[PDB]
Amino acid sequence: DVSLFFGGLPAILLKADTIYRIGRQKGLEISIADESMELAHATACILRRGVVRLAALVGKIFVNDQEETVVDIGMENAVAGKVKLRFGNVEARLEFG
Amino acid sequence: MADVSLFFGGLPAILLKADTIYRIGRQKGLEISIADESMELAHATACILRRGVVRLAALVGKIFVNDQEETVVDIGMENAVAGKVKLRFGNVEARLEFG
Numbered sequence: 001d002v003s004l005f006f007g008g009l010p011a012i013l014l015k016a017d018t019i020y021r022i023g024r025q026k027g028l029e030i031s032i033a034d035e036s037m038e039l040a041h042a043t044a045c046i047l048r049r050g051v052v053r054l055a056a057l058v059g060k061i062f063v064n065d066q067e068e069t070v071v072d073i074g075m076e077n078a079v080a081g082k083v084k085l086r087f088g089n090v091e092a093r094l095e096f097g
Numbered sequence: 098m099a100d101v102s103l104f105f106g107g108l109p110a111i112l113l114k115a116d117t118i119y120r121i122g123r124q125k126g127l128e129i130s131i132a133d134e135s136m137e138l139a140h141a142t143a144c145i146l147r148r149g150v151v152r153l154a155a156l157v158g159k160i161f162v163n164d165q166e167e168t169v170v171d172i173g174m175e176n177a178v179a180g181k182v183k184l185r186f187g188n189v190e191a192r193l194e195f196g
Contacts, residue, residue: 017124021118040117043154045157046157047157055154
């Protein structure tokens with residue numbers, strides 16, 4: 001249903017009822033080694049069926065180049081089923097199935 | 098001082114460490130796992146945003162700060178009375194205490 005793609009990783013198949021921790025800290029669901037990412041950068045969740053919530057913690061988040069603090073994203077917000085994300089200076093892509 | 102602790106009734110205080118994402122929910126194995134029906138499995142997160150300031154973000158569940166609903170909120174000593182800030186996660190009462 002909702003997949004998250006960072007360069008160099010397998011697609012992350014986002015599951016319900018799970019808090020995804022995103023940062024440069026090791027041992028997180030999404031640990032990215034890039035120096036532009038904060039140790040505790042952000043968190044993602046499935047808010048309800050087909051809808052992902054992203055929340056910025058210590059790091060900044062951009063959705064299609066617009067800064068957001070907290071944002072809910074579903075297929076209706078996508079272009080050709082995709083959304084560009086950026087965490088610090090690290091780009092990623094969400095895809096809705 | 099820059100000590101910030103989270104209290105859920107009759108649980109030991111959780112002292113919040115910098116650069117750490119605290120998962121808050123009913124799911125077992127989280128930093129803050131609370132067995133209450135009104136807590137969602139993936140309810141919220143807390144993290145030290147900067148010295149003496151905690152950011153809380155509501156995920157699946159709702160958060161209330163001194164009874165006012167918030168989605169993302171930053172809380173430091175300026176929001177405390179006698180060192181305390183009242184929080185609610187769903188129907189679960191909690192408080193932040195600032196050193």
